Amino acid sequence: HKCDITLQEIIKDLNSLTEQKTLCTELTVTDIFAASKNTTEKETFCRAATVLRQFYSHHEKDTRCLGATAQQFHRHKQLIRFLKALDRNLWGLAGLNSCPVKEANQSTLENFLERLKTIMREKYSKCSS
């Protein structure tokens, strides 16, 4: 369960997400990593899955993000697609729907995805030889 290949799928989604910039990636999420580390692994995933769901829900049809050019619109849809795929995997890992996220600090979506990627790669590393 813990060292399941879902970890690789999350890492994969994150790899695409962070190699991708859009009009929208500087917009903010609640910084669940500004906490003092007071949560189980399942709580962490639930928290991350929560803030990302707020983000894609709010920005999928947001005029600042939707794009003027074909390429901008494409990148916007890609981003929302990948966020939903990552979110889906996170919820499957979490095993939890209800986790309050209490941080004030906002970070750009971009910085948040890079942090989550570092934590995911650390989980993968702790799983293998």
Author numbering: 1 to 129
Paper text:
Interleukin 4 (IL-4) is a pleiotropic cytokine that plays a major regulatory role in the immune system.
Since the hallmark of the super-agonistic variants was a clearly decreased dissociation rate constant (relative koff (T13D or F82D) = 0.3 – 0.4 koff (IL-4wt)), this confirms the above mechanism by which Arg85 is involved in generating the higher binding affinity. To exclude the possibility that structural changes in addition to the removal of the Arg85 side chain play a role in the changes in binding stability, we determined the structures of the IL-4 variants R85A, T13D-R85A and F82D-R85A.
